Amino acid sequence: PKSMQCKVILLDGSEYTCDVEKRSRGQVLFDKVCEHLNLLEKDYFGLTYRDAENQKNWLDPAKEIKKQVRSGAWHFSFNVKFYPPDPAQLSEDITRYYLCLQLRDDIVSGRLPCSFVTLALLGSYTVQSELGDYDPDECGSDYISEFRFAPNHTKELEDKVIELHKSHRGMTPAEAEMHFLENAKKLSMYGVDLHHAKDSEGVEIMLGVCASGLLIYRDRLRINRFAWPKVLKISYKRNNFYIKIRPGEFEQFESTIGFKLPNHRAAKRLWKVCVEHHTFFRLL
Numbered sequence: 001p002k003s004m005q006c007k008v009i010l011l012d013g014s015e016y017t018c019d020v021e022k023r024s025r026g027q028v029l030f031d032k033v034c035e036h037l038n039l040l041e042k043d044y045f046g047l048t049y050r051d052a053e054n055q056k057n058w059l060d061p062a063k064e065i066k067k068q069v070r071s072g073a074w075h076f077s078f079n080v081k082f083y084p085p086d087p088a089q090l091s092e093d094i095t096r097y098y099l100c101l102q103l104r105d106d107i108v109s110g111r112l113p114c115s116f117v118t119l120a121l122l123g124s125y126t127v128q129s130e131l132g133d134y135d136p137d138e139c140g141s142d143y144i145s146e147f148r149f150a151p152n153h154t155k156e157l158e159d160k161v162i163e164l165h166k167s168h169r170g171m172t173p174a175e176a177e178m179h180f181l182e183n184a185k186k187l188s189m190y191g192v193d194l195h196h197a198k199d200s201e202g203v204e205i206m207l208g209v210c211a212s213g214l215l216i217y218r219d220r221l222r223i224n225r226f227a228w229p230k231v232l233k234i235s236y237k238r239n240n241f242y243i244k245i246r247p248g249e250f251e252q253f254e255s256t257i258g259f260k261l262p263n264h265r266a267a268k269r270l271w272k273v274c275v276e277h278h279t280f281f282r283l284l
């Protein structure tokens with residue numbers, strides 16, 4: 001029974017390797033990775049792979065791995081797929097831990113923009129969780145953490161992490177990880193999956209997919225929002241993506257809104273993540 005080697009980049013940056021039968025569905029690999037991670041609250045997570053265009057795609061757990069990775073390597077990342085709006089409602093501390101690891105990469109990568117002060121506060125909770133109580137012996141006036149806190153590190157930011165770390169004496173890792181999440185969850189781009197697009201006029205916009213709905217960023221001023229309940233149908237056709245809005249009160253007709261994506265693959269990818277978010281966040 002022929003098996004393919006799988007390599008999975010974990011959220012701590014280490015690599016998990018296993019074998020699966022070459023006709024295996026994504027769920028088989030996902031279950032192995034989650035068992036490795038001692039993760040029970042699996043519904044928030046997924047595996048990603050890179051397609052022939054180097055775009056990130058979710059591995060569909062219901063479909064054969066081979067039919068998704070096609071010509072590419074059996075190389076994956078383990079990621080948060082659905083960011084919980086209220087991480088305090090998760091059952092297990094270990095779930096919150098993996099969500100913290102993801103958010104730390106979202107911040108360092110610049111996917112999740114963050115003020116100086118919030119970068120320093122999030123850093124201070126990570127330091128408290130991972131080293132415990134502040135110790136002056138380790139950190140002199142010239143201290144620079146090994147910890148990556150931001151897309152760009154400054155001495156000022158390092159100083160502020162240390163100043164806030166001092167305030168967290170007695171804080172336990174789950175407690176510090178919960179404070180991390182109570183701050184991160186409020187950030188305007190928390191759990192927003194962004195897609196480059198053009199409006200029905202050719203104006204370059206961003207489409208954001210998240211728990212609360214579909215966001216349209218037409219620049220720093222003029223952000224439109226479509227809550228998931230207000231969306232009856234998501235469709236794609238060639239390079240175009242469409243949302244069918246419920247009729248407003250006393251309105252005769254549904255309304256359909258159309259966008260232009262980079263290519264057909266990008267339209268199908270945006271369609272699939274919207275359908276998935278709509279289904280996931282509808283239920284809980």
Ligand SMILES: CN1CCN(C(=O)Nc2ccc(F)cc2)CC1
Pocket residue numbers: 043084085086279280281282283284
């Ligand atoms: C396999 N499904 C996954 C979706 N669904 C669920 O509970 N979603 C959810 C929404 C929002 C939240 F914050 C947590 C979970 C039930 C089982």
